[PDB]
Amino acid sequence: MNRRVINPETMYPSVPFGFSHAVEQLSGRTLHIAGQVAWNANGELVGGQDLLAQTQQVLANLKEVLRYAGATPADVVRLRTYVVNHSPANLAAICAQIGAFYEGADPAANSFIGVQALALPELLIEIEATACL
Amino acid sequence: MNRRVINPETMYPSVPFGFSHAVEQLSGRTLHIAGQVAWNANGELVGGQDLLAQTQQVLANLKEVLRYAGATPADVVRLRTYVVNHSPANLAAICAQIGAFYEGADPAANSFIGVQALALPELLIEIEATACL
Amino acid sequence: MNRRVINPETMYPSVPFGFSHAVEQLSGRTLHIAGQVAWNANGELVGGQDLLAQTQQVLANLKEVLRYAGATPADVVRLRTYVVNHSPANLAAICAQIGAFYEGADPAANSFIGVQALALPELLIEIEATACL
């Protein structure tokens, strides 16, 4: 509909990792969503020190900001994933969760970055998104 | 005018932190500004090893690139903030400075990332921006 | 053609570093390319533990995704560069390689971020791109 996904035969398969190599955006209106973080609406921390749990709250927050603006995850054109003290042992789970975030749609482009810190120590993952309308 | 800001009632309040949860861009022309850095026009370092001081130079540089392209900070649709050896004790100041960067406009979306290094050791903060026209 | 580059006289010269301070995108169709990584089409690692070598594979991958979508590097509006355990001694080489990636076109905007890790330990550099059509 709004976007078209590009996964070249000449490239390694990315969708097992929960992303597409590129998304073409043909629509004009773009929505830029700030980096989301494992906070509820009172700014309380969802998940404790479990990355997997925090990752769910982030996705939920993304989905909610999307909804509020009139979009769904299928409208997402690009993700960026920022993880604190990243360990390859959590990678599978994170890919699974981002893959599931698209609720069956082709996955957007992603970048997976292991950072040193987020805004506050309690924060373990941040995901930002771009979508079209 | 060019952009519309989105801050859901169902989300924690972001504008105290100097960003909005999402910016809708309705214009067609987008301006992509490279990560700015605490350098003056001779590539000399403004600020010494004070993050706060370097952060001012970066904002100034952003504002200047904006001006040169025909835009203002109110036109900014998204920021990304990269901080070296980030400590939560500087967070308040950084939010204050980015908040003030919009000169009264609703703040754009931001992501706050604590990185390991920038291009050179002397560099302590980098902020990139996207805006519309 | 598709994009216009902006390098203010009032700013330090960026093109020696292989980027422009800002790119104006006048076209409507945007292409978002996921962070590319030193993998061939079988997901095998190109480059071993040499950053320079891995950096070539990444650029090649970017160029290929571009080609597949119908674009060239001259169409690139913005790069983001993520480097693991970055050392300023590799900076010159990386700038040279990104500079050459545009095959003579004015270089896009870039951000150079020294990260803690990528998706897997073997990975040493990741570059994502945005382009227009």
How many residue pairs bridge chain A and chain C with CB atoms within 8 Å of each other? 99
Contact state of C65 with A6 under an 8 Å Cβ cutoff = yes
Q: Is A10 helix (H, G, I), strand (E, B) or coil?
A: coil
How many residue pairs bridge chain B and chain C with CB atoms within 8 Å of each other? 99
Give the separation between CA C23 and CA A24, rounded to whole angstroms: 19
Give the separation between CA C15 and CA B9, rounded to whole angstroms: 44
Contact state of C32 with A115 under an 8 Å Cβ cutoff = no
Q: Which residue has 């990636």 as its token pair?
A: C101
**What is the distance in angstroms between the CA of the first residue and the CA of the last residue of chain A?**
10
Give the separation between CA C46 and CA C38, rounded to whole angstroms: 5
Residue B54 β-bridge partners: none
Distance of alpha carbon B77 from the chain centroid: 10
Give the separation between CA C5 and CA B34, rounded to whole angstroms: 11
The encoded tokens of residue C133 equal 């059509």
With beta carbons less than 8 A apart as the criterion, state whether C111 and B126 touch: yes
Let me know if A91 is exposed, middle or buried by CB neighbors in 10 A (0-12, 13-18, 19+).
middle
Q: How many residues does chain B have?
A: 133
Give the separation between CA B57 and CA C108, rounded to whole angstroms: 22
CA distance C64 to chain B (A): 23
Q: Which residues of A touch B110 (CB under 8 A)?
A: 34-35
Distance of alpha carbon B18 from the chain centroid: 10
Q: Which residues of A touch C35 (CB under 8 A)?
A: 109-113
The Cα-based distances of A126 to A55, C14, C83 in angstroms read 8, 30, 19
Contact state of B8 with A82 under an 8 Å Cβ cutoff = no
DSSP for chain B?
Answer: --EEEE--TTS---GGGT--SEEEE-SS-EEEEEEEESB-TTSPBSSTT-HHHHHHHHHHHHHHHHHHHT--GGGEEEEEEEEET--GGGHHHHHHHHHHHTTTSPP-B--EEEESB-SSTT--EEEEEEEE-
Does the beta carbon of C133 lie under 8 angstroms from any beta carbon of chain B? no
Q: In what order do the strands lie in the sheet with A3-6?
A: A3-6, A22-25, C30-37, C125-132, C76-84, C112-115
Give the separation between CA A19 and CA B7, rounded to whole angstroms: 27
CB C118: neighbour CB atoms within 10 A?
23
Give the separation between CA C72 and CA C63, rounded to whole angstroms: 7
Backbone angles phi, psi at B37, to 5 degrees: -155, 155
Backbone angles phi, psi at C114, to 5 degrees: -90, 110
Q: How was this structure determined?
A: X-ray
Give the separation between CA C89 and CA A125, rounded to whole angstroms: 30
Give the separation between CA C114 and CA C126, rounded to whole angstroms: 11
Q: Which residues of C touch B117 (CB under 8 A)?
A: 86, 114
Long-range contacts from A47-55, C-beta under 8 angstroms, 24+ separation: A47/A124, A49/A122, A49/A124, A51/A83, A51/A90, A51/A93, A51/A94, A51/A124, A51/A125, A52/A90, A52/A93, A52/A97, A54/A123, A54/A124, A54/A125, A55/A93, A55/A94, A55/A97, A55/A125, A55/A127
Contact state of B28 with C24 under an 8 Å Cβ cutoff = no
Which chain B residues in 23-52 lie under 8 Å from chain C, judged by CB atoms?
28-36, 39-43
With beta carbons less than 8 A apart as the criterion, state whether C77 and C3 touch: yes
Contact state of B35 with C111 under an 8 Å Cβ cutoff = yes
With a CB cutoff of 8 Å and minimum separation 6, the contacts of A115 are A82, A83, A84, A86, B113, B114, B115, B116, C115, C116
With a CB cutoff of 8 Å and minimum separation 6, the contacts of B38 are B45, B46, B47, B53, B54, B55, B57, B58, B123, B124, B125
Contact state of A119 with B109 under an 8 Å Cβ cutoff = no
Does the beta carbon of A86 lie under 8 angstroms from any beta carbon of chain C? yes
CB A131: neighbour CB atoms within 10 A?
31
- Pairing label, strands C112-115, C76-84: parallel
Q: Which chains touch B (3 or more CB pairs under 8 A)?
A: A, C
The partner residue sitting opposite B32, judged by closest CB among C8, C78, C114, is C78
Residue C130 β-bridge partners: C32, C78
**What is the distance in angstroms between the CA of the first residue and the CA of the last residue of chain B?**
10
Where exactly are the structural domains of chain B?
Answer: 2-133
With beta carbons less than 8 A apart as the criterion, state whether A10 and A97 touch: no
Count of alpha carbons within 13 angstroms of residue B17, beta-carbon side: 22
State this model's resolution in angstroms.
3.0
DSSP for C48-109?
Answer: TT-HHHHHHHHHHHHHHHHHHHT--GGGEEEEEEEEET--GGGHHHHHHHHHHHTTTSPP-B
Give the separation between CA C8 and CA C47, rounded to whole angstroms: 37
Give the separation between CA C44 and CA C49, rounded to whole angstroms: 13
The Cα-based distances of C75 to B17, B53, C70, C82 in angstroms read 35, 36, 10, 21
Nearest residue in chain B measured CA to CA from A127 = B111
Give the separation between CA C117 and CA B111, rounded to whole angstroms: 18
Dihedral (CA of C97, C102, C107, C112) sign: negative
With beta carbons less than 8 A apart as the criterion, state whether C106 and C20 touch: yes
Does the beta carbon of A73 lie under 8 angstroms from any beta carbon of chain B? no
CA quadruple C114, C117, C119, C123: dihedral, nearest 10: 80
Does the beta carbon of A89 lie under 8 angstroms from any beta carbon of chain B? no
The encoded tokens of residue C49 equal 């533990």
CB C43: neighbour CB atoms within 10 A?
13
Nearest residue in chain B measured CA to CA from A34 = B109
